[PDB]
Amino acid sequence: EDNMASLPATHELHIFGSINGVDFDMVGQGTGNPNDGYEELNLKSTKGDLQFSPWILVPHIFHQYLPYPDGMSPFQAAMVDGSGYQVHRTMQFEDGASLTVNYRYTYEGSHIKGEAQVKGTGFPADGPVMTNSLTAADWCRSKKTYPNDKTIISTFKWSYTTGNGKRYRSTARTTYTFAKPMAANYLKNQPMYVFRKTELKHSKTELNFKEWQKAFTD
Numbered sequence: 101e102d103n104m105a106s107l108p109a110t111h112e113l114h115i116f117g118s119i120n121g122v123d124f125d126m127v128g129q130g131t132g133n134p135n136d137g138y139e140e141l142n143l144k145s146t147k148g149d150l151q152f153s154p155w156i157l158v159p160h161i162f163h164q165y166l167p168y169p170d171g172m173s174p175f176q177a178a179m180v181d182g183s184g185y186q187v188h189r190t191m192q193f194e195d196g197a198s199l200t201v202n203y204r205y206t207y208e209g210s211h212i213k214g215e216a217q218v219k220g221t222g223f224p225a226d227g228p229v230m231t232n233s234l235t236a237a238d239w240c241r242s243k244k245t246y247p248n249d250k251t252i253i254s255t256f257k258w259s260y261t262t263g264n265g266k267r268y269r270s271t272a273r274t275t276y277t278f279a280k281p282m283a284a285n286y287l288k289n290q291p292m293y294v295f296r297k298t299e300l301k302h303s304k305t306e307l308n309f310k311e312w313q314k315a316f317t318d
């Protein structure tokens with residue numbers, strides 16, 4: 101079933117699920133540069149106007165594009181050798197909302213197909229998500245640790261800026277589960293930090309996303 105692949109050059113995403121019990125579904129194509137972490141993605145809704153801020157899909161909308169300082173990231177390594185990994189992210193927001201995302205990928209040569217299943221609940225109807233008041237997301241530093249040879253934990257504090265210049269805050273915990281053990285040399289450099297920035301242009305039915313990533317032993 102699983103075959104060896106290459107460093108990624110192109111990708112696609114099917115992201116779907118529900119926010120406050122209302123279904124959404126988006127599909128589209130992207131590209132990126134595995135030598136510096138950069139990604140671009142276009143998504144189009146297949147179920148009409150999004151009923152919530154498209155910014156809530158950031159950061160969730162491909163660490164296979166992330167290099168490490170002295171070679172491939174474990175995420176990259178697992179694509180190239182084909183064995184891969186699965187991802188579970190939980191995010192809790194300061195107003196009590198929460199969001200889970202589960203990812204599965206398949207690989208063919210330099211192309212990734214991603215499936216991201218989202219469940220968000222508890223967003224207040226007058227909050228910044230359900231009122232489309234999010235305008236931006238801050239630079240964010242993630243901390244990556246390895247509790248065993250098949251697991252990476254990524255944690256980060258997350259913030260959006262609203263239309264009023266307020267901060268909407270959350271924390272995230274992401275668990276990466278590798279099919280096969282990671283190389284021992286990864287375990288010897290803990291933690292790894294990754295600094296990322298995101299950009300989003302959107303309508304109610306389409307978005308264009310960009311991400312920059314840089315890992316540091318620091």
Ligand SMILES: [Cl-]
Pocket residue numbers: 242254274
């Ligand atoms: Cl992450």
